[PDB]
RNA sequence: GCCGCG
């Protein structure tokens, strides 16, 4: 009793602009699908972005290089807007070596195996001295959403050499999404609506692939609605007492009082432990002395006690 | 700490601190200067017969009290005469309507009243005086950003502030730029002006990332590329929060 | 939009400079968008010079008389590439843009003269009931930051 | 003592009896309480731990 | 004075005023509703103003 | 465009100017001293301000004229500024009078009142002189609030 | 890493009465709560199959404004009362029902004629409290299955005014959702703190459990995407 | 002592 939209008449205005048309839609599904698709496209779309840079003679972002007109911060900001595509790799390294005069563009990046430069007229720096050369290594990763360079701390597990410059990562290919709903050309049906989505990206992602991925994401999220239903830790504790090397006369008395773990022992205050039979005042000092030998003073308070 | 009718073209009526020091600290207007003695004077244009000539007289506070002074936005014809017979004026600390042959001086421009800080607010005449005061005092606390971005709606005093503030690099014998770097600019001076002997070139050493008094960053980046002709007084590099020699 | 502000701060504070600057920024960015569009499709120079002249020849008896006839092609192309983000128009302090000039500047840029457009909600997709004032206002970041407070 | 200061912003999602407190502003106002909870849960026996 | 001091201000008052107003002609006129829930359904889906 | 200036503002301003010219010539006749003419000019300017504000409120209150199923009627305006003032969310009749109607007669160099008022609102510009007048009052208010 | 999204876990349900429900889902990726809530609300309110009365006929006075022969309730209240009664029709699209009564006592929905395919869920729902004192009241209503909500804008049926007078143009509320509301709040898991939590408050007129309503809406919205998820499917 | 913040 419902018509199913079919992706027809996908038309490519330019290498960046795109229009995607869904011809058959019901009376009110046009706006619902349009807004869901637009939010998904703008929110989460996999893309590739520059994550870190390493220029030869640079040390930090706030330096200058002889012969180049732009500061290193400007070079990083230019590299941030560079867009690439990679097939089957998520950790690509691009080497850029250029010596001479004039601008240095993404076109003179050394041609890797499968790394597509979408716009090779994207200038990133200038060289003004004749005997000046620029050599740099750019790391490109694949991600989902915006990730600042400061937030990532997991990369600090292994030390980084002085000179590895971190840039922020965008990871999102889609820049602008709009949509419109008009009347269909279907004359036999009473009244049908057609949805048109205009996209503006960085040239990285295919429009058809982007709409397909967004629809897949929406269906995967909705799959959880189709079936609702549903209607003492620190290791020094929890050890046997037979590791403190107590005295012979203290062996039976501890067992007599059902103290078999180190943790349960440290909860017994002095005033009542003295009332225990044949404890011995001098022997009470011995157990305290060996208990303080590990850093535990007698009389702590815990919150529970498992059998283990 | 009040605004005296003689504050017109000498001391800004808008720009002043808010809480304790209101009225005790002021800023000079754009055109105010000092006499040989030290009193504040302000430019005005002489009026001869009914025409408005171009010669400029600087009037002090005492002298302006007896002349009849016109207003900046008074219509004029091509010959310089007043378009309308009865024009607004200030005679002795007041304002009224006077005949076209009675005036003796005219305001030189429409920025005479407002200071350098308050002459940067577009559409100032549509703002409340106190809100304009807060805006003027708040412009001075802005922090220079990573990249300067010019104002889409400006006033035109931004070139003056950027150039005369001294943060930028301005040519003094501008010829043709020979070498440009993110740190240096080397210009070969054209032969038309040259000190005889030892030839001569001009080298500007831009000040790179350097802390300011308020712990912001003072940075200069070049504006010229290569072989680009440059004239005297042009900006070579723009300092903090400046775009192409214009305050941003 | 980039920033959303409260309109209730306008009438009780009497900042109509806010609204006039917003409209003027919208008009300037409209002209900039037009220039960037005619530059994107590699339109031949003469029509670009004519459009930029028309933009600069606006206003009611303005003392600025910039003429591109004396400009050669290269400088005009450089200027147009510099005006791509917008036309940096300027109003002197007490004698600046009037209402008619702002409205006709908006008209030249193919924008609504009322200064208000139709805004759609970004979360529900429903159009807001009344037209909303949208423009470009020049905002500053003061030195008062929570990192130091 | 046991006091802090910060800039206020608007939270419209709050209730009438609730306020928003940064996690950095806390963990500093509530240091002795956190010490007590750590010691009582057995996580850190000594106060130094 | 005893008057309430936690009262809606600014945007809350604007919203409550915009909600509780009438215009001579709008979408829906003299229409009969079984309750407020039908009113909310009619407004949200766009069949009434 | 949400601040609708009344269309008759220039007419009432013209009548006020004509009356003040008549009282000026009457003073020049010598039958009136300075005090009486000063009081009378303040009175006529205040009456003109009252009438201007009344006209602006009249044009802003029921500015909407929306037709119905039969003929057309007149009902409360949905102008955003009036919607703010009437709702009590922000603003009052005085500030709307400053925004659309004439700014009004105002002065405080020493507490006195100047003869000619500020005839220009905030929708239109203020001349250099009128802004310099408004500054006296703003400065006095700010200093009083501080002290 | 990529392509993998957070899926809500431990869906919470707070059943109220038999037609009021509050369903909480947590966590969802940032900005997904609003998308899902908006889409579900829109398709639950605008397009859902259902059945509600559409036409009425009262013997005697047939004008839109009628004296009602002294039935102590204006016929507008009659139309309002019969609007809200909910029915379940099985295997039929249009069906006629008749109610005839006499003698002092309110007329409820149970007192209408009973058909096998017609299953009325609120038989004690009262149309009116009979004619004043005692009298005979007879009426015939017609109910058809529809979609969403459609007001009585016009009849545009039969010829002249036969369909209006035989119908009186009662507003039809086909969709079995009395009220849908959604609220999106802050929720978090592990180090992540900018996560979204969805709360859905549903009330149905009946004939449909609110959980069944949400499940049906999810089903139709998901199968509206099979043209894009079929080939692009993991399984 | 000066400057600023509400």
PDB file of C-alpha atoms in Angstrom, chain A residues 3-8 22 24 33 208 211-212 215-216 219, chain G residues 221-232:
ATOM      1  CA  UNK A   3       5.349   3.136  -3.038  1.00  0.00           C
ATOM      2  CA  UNK A   4       9.108   2.674  -2.764  1.00  0.00           C
ATOM      3  CA  UNK A   5      11.408   5.502  -3.897  1.00  0.00           C
ATOM      4  CA  UNK A   6      13.943   4.527  -6.544  1.00  0.00           C
ATOM      5  CA  UNK A   7      17.113   6.530  -7.126  1.00  0.00           C
ATOM      6  CA  UNK A   8      16.638   7.760 -10.698  1.00  0.00           C
ATOM      7  CA  UNK A  22      14.079  10.106  -5.765  1.00  0.00           C
ATOM      8  CA  UNK A  24       8.196   8.095  -6.242  1.00  0.00           C
ATOM      9  CA  UNK A  33      13.313  11.300   4.306  1.00  0.00           C
ATOM     10  CA  UNK A 208      25.301   7.869  -5.074  1.00  0.00           C
ATOM     11  CA  UNK A 211      23.185   8.575  -0.275  1.00  0.00           C
ATOM     12  CA  UNK A 212      23.502   4.782  -0.149  1.00  0.00           C
ATOM     13  CA  UNK A 215      20.307   5.185   3.945  1.00  0.00           C
ATOM     14  CA  UNK A 216      22.218   2.170   5.261  1.00  0.00           C
ATOM     15  CA  UNK A 219      18.164   1.560   8.420  1.00  0.00           C
TER      16      UNK A 219
ATOM     17  CA  UNK G 221      10.241   3.658   7.655  1.00  0.00           C
ATOM     18  CA  UNK G 222      12.890   0.936   7.373  1.00  0.00           C
ATOM     19  CA  UNK G 223      11.192  -0.805   4.452  1.00  0.00           C
ATOM     20  CA  UNK G 224      10.924   2.587   2.752  1.00  0.00           C
ATOM     21  CA  UNK G 225      14.718   2.297   2.298  1.00  0.00           C
ATOM     22  CA  UNK G 226      14.970  -1.213   0.837  1.00  0.00           C
ATOM     23  CA  UNK G 227      15.822   0.272  -2.566  1.00  0.00           C
ATOM     24  CA  UNK G 228      19.116   1.470  -1.037  1.00  0.00           C
ATOM     25  CA  UNK G 229      19.807  -1.126   1.679  1.00  0.00           C
ATOM     26  CA  UNK G 230      19.001  -4.303  -0.301  1.00  0.00           C
ATOM     27  CA  UNK G 231      22.171  -4.494  -2.401  1.00  0.00           C
ATOM     28  CA  UNK G 232      24.109  -2.612   0.306  1.00  0.00           C
TER      29      UNK G 232
END
